[PDB]
Structure formats: C-alpha cells, structure tokens
C-alpha cells in the first residue's frame, strides 16, 4: 500500500546509516563536515545518486545562520523593482537611487535612511503577497507591488533543497578524534501557505536589495539579483516538513 520518493528513500537510508554507525573517526565546522564526509561514503554503499547540495548544520550553528530560500522579483507591476528604487529609494554615492531594506509582515519598518516605511501583507483572497508603502505620516500610499502565490510556489518547487540539522557527541581515544551523531532533522518541504504564515508571523523576511549600475552603457539602470526570502535556519524547523531520524 505504501509509496514514497525513491530519492528520499535513499537519502533517509543514508542518514539513518550514519546516525546508527556509532563513533566515527575524523581529522576535523568539524561536526557538520564529518557528517558530509560520511554521507558521501553512503552514496557508494547504497549505489545512490549524489547527495550533493544538502546543507548540514548543527542546531547550534543553525541558530546563528540566515538561509536565503530563493530570490524573486515582484510579479506586478512590470518593472516594479525600478519603480521602487526610483520612487521610494535614496541616492547612493553616484546620484543613483537604491533601495536596500529588510521588510517583514508583522511590523512596519522604521529606518531613518529612507523617507518611506514598508510592510508585507498577505492578500489571501487574491493569492498575492503585497508590499505596503507608508510615508512618515503613516499614510499607506501604495500596495500595488506584489508576488503571486503561484510565482512563489514555482520558486519553492525549483529552488528548495534538503537541509539536515544535526547534533553529535565527541570524544578522544588513543590520540584520535571521534563524533557520534545523535539524530538528524531532515527538512524536506515548505509550502507557499507556510511561507506566507511565516512572513505574517515575523519569522520570514523579504530582503529588498535593488541597486543601480554606476558605469558603462547600463549606468544609472537597475541592478537587482532578486528580492531574497530569508529565514533563520532553526526557525525553518517550525515551518517546514521535517523528518526526525534517530
Ligand atoms: Cl567511520
Ligand atoms: Cl534509534
């Protein structure tokens, strides 16, 4: 009756074998990198495809880490990032407008470096995530800029990777160092609904970083690698689908 992802079956097996393998010798970041080494050895033992691009951190290191889930420019309007920088941004060294601001869904921003404040609001009925813009007199002057839920879903589908948050014991025996892994929390999915709840809760941030080229034929024009959707790595265990392997 039961079915599951073939790849996930192998990855879980590999992680289960590392955890159940007791003390592992290492030449030591040490806890995570040793885990990465052992996982690499499981590819051969399982004749599995590569378990590459899985980020490995301890709970301790995860708590200090900020993960970018993906980058993505607004769905609407066309040329939104150019409007935002020119209208609401500030002049840089070179006389070109830029907008660099972290925005959340629980509070408005309050930066003294810009003449506008920002908040994310989830328009659940229209299935869009809106950027609200306020002037310093608390007037909400614009909520036209948005990301569709489908666009965000597509980013998640294309860009999400597995992550394992782990812990271990260590010891020294006969001048040699060993780690023994307690467990692994394997993050496997994040839904658009959970993403949007996380923005509302103040746990997921939207990092707008819209620059301008200073020279060349593109001088003065928008330089933007995409608005980044970011979350503390421990915090991701609140929102994601997570398998505990012990
Ligand atoms: Cl070993
Ligand atoms: Cl066990």
UniProtKB/TrEMBL annotation:
Transmembrane segments: none annotated. Ca(2+) 1 binds at residues 50, 55-56. InterPro entries: MvaI_BcnI (IPR029127), MvaI_BcnI_rec (IPR043005). It comes from the Bacteria. It holds the Pfam family MvaI_BcnI. Ca(2+) 2 binds at residues 121-122. Residues 14-236 form the MvaI/BcnI restriction endonuclease domain. Keywords: Calcium, Metal-binding. GO terms for molecular function: metal ion binding. This is R.MvaI. It comes from Kocuria varians (Micrococcus varians).
């Amino acid at each position: 009756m039961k079915s599951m992802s073939e790849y996930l079956n192998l990855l879980k097996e590999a992680i289960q074998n590392v955890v159940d393998g007791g003390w592992h010798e290492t030449k030591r970041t040490g806890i995570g990198k040793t885990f990465e080494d052992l996982l690499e050895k499981e590819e051969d033992n399982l004749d599995a495809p590569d378990f590459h691009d899985i980020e490995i951190k301890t709970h301790e290191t995860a708590a200090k880490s900020l993960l970018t889930l993906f980058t993505k420019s607004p769905t609407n309007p066309r040329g939104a990032n150019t409007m935002l920088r020119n209208r609401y941004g500030k002049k840089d060294e070179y006389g070109n407008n830029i907008l660099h601001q972290t925005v959340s869904g629980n509070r408005k921003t309050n930066s003294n470096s810009y003449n506008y404040d920002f908040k994310i609001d989830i328009d659940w009925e229209s299935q869009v995530v809106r950027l609200e813009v306020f002037d310093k007199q608390d007037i909400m002057i614009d909520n036209s800029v948005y990301w569709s839920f489908d666009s965000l879903q597509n980013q998640l589908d294309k860009k999400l990777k597995y992550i394992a948050v782990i812990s271990a014991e260590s010891k020294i025996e006969n001048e040699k160092k060993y780690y023994k892994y307690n467990s692994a929390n394997l993050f496997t999915d994040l839904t658009v609904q959970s993403l949007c709840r996380g923005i509302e809760n103040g746990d997921i941030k939207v990092d707008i970083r819209i620059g301008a080229y200073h020279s060349g034929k593109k001088k003065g024009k928008t330089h933007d690698h995409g608005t980044a959707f970011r979350i503390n790595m421990e915090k991701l265990l609140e929102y994601g689908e997570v398998k505990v392997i012990v």
